[PDB]
Design an enzyme around this catalytic site. Sequence first.
Site, short mmCIF file in Angstrom:
data_model
loop_
_atom_site.label_atom_id
_atom_site.label_comp_id
_atom_site.label_asym_id
_atom_site.label_seq_id
_atom_site.Cartn_x
_atom_site.Cartn_y
_atom_site.Cartn_z
N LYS A 1 1.02 -1.09 -0.06
CA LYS A 1 -0.06 0.05 0.07
C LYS A 1 0.77 1.25 -0.05
O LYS A 1 1.97 1.44 0.83
CB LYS A 1 -0.88 0.14 1.25
N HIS B 1 -12.96 6.43 6.34
CA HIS B 1 -11.72 6.70 5.43
C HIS B 1 -11.24 7.78 5.96
O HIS B 1 -11.53 8.67 6.79
CB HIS B 1 -12.31 7.00 4.29
N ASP C 1 -8.95 10.80 4.72
CA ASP C 1 -8.73 11.57 3.58
C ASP C 1 -7.57 12.40 3.38
O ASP C 1 -7.14 12.39 2.16
CB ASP C 1 -10.20 12.49 3.39
O1 0G0 Z 1 -2.73 11.78 4.12
C1 0G0 Z 1 -3.25 10.48 3.57
N1 0G0 Z 1 -3.33 9.30 4.37
C2 0G0 Z 1 -3.82 7.94 4.02
O2 0G0 Z 1 -3.75 7.17 4.80
N2 0G0 Z 1 -4.77 8.11 2.97
C3 0G0 Z 1 -5.46 7.12 2.43
C4 0G0 Z 1 -6.17 6.27 2.97
C5 0G0 Z 1 -7.68 6.38 2.51
N3 0G0 Z 1 -8.09 5.22 3.21
C6 0G0 Z 1 -9.66 4.90 3.21
O3 0G0 Z 1 -9.99 3.62 3.81
C7 0G0 Z 1 -9.73 2.66 2.88
C8 0G0 Z 1 -10.60 1.29 3.16
O4 0G0 Z 1 -10.45 0.39 2.48
C9 0G0 Z 1 -10.01 3.03 1.52
O5 0G0 Z 1 -9.11 2.72 0.39
C10 0G0 Z 1 -9.86 4.79 1.76
O6 0G0 Z 1 -11.46 5.08 1.65
N4 0G0 Z 1 -7.26 4.40 3.78
N5 0G0 Z 1 -6.24 4.97 3.63
C11 0G0 Z 1 -4.62 9.21 2.20
C12 0G0 Z 1 -4.09 10.44 2.49
F1 0G0 Z 1 -4.11 11.34 1.63
#
Ligand code: 0G0
EC number: 4.6.1.18
Length: 124
Positions: free
Chosen positions: A41, A119, A121
């Site tokens: 990831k 989530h 964001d």
């Molecule tokens: O600064 C951040 N930090 C960060 O961790 N993310 C990603 C994310 C989104 N998600 C949400 O939860 C996941 C559950 O499957 C989905 O990919 C997304 O909605 N998880 N990680 C994105 C950023 F800009």
Amino acid sequence: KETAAAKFERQHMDSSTSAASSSNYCNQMMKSRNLTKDRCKPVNTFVHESLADVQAVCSQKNVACKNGQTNCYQSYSTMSITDCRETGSSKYPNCAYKTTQANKHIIVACEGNPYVPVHFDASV
Ligand SMILES: O=c1[nH]c(=O)n(Cc2cn([C@@H]3O[C@@H](CO)[C@H](O)[C@H]3O)nn2)cc1F
């Protein structure tokens, strides 16, 4: 089966440490929270605040989500967080990450009853 709220806790909650996150933190945590199982990831953020404090964000500042949905909320206070970003020389299954600690406002999407984060964001 894992609820969306549980998945958010698994992917984004780390209340156990304050910030202390060594240079090793993301390498260890991305693996232990099972974010390196099917692929590396690329980006993930851990929040070092209480579950109650993060859950409380769902009733704080309503802001637009990156995908255009309206169910995102920005924390009124900065929070201790760690960003994990996959290195350029990282090759699955040996996922490698750069660990960056910060204190920033978090933005989460919330859903459900009870209304809780599902989530992560952004951080600003
Ligand atoms: O600064 C951040 N930090 C960060 O961790 N993310 C990603 C994310 C989104 N998600 C949400 O939860 C996941 C559950 O499957 C989905 O990919 C997304 O909605 N998880 N990680 C994105 C950023 F800009």
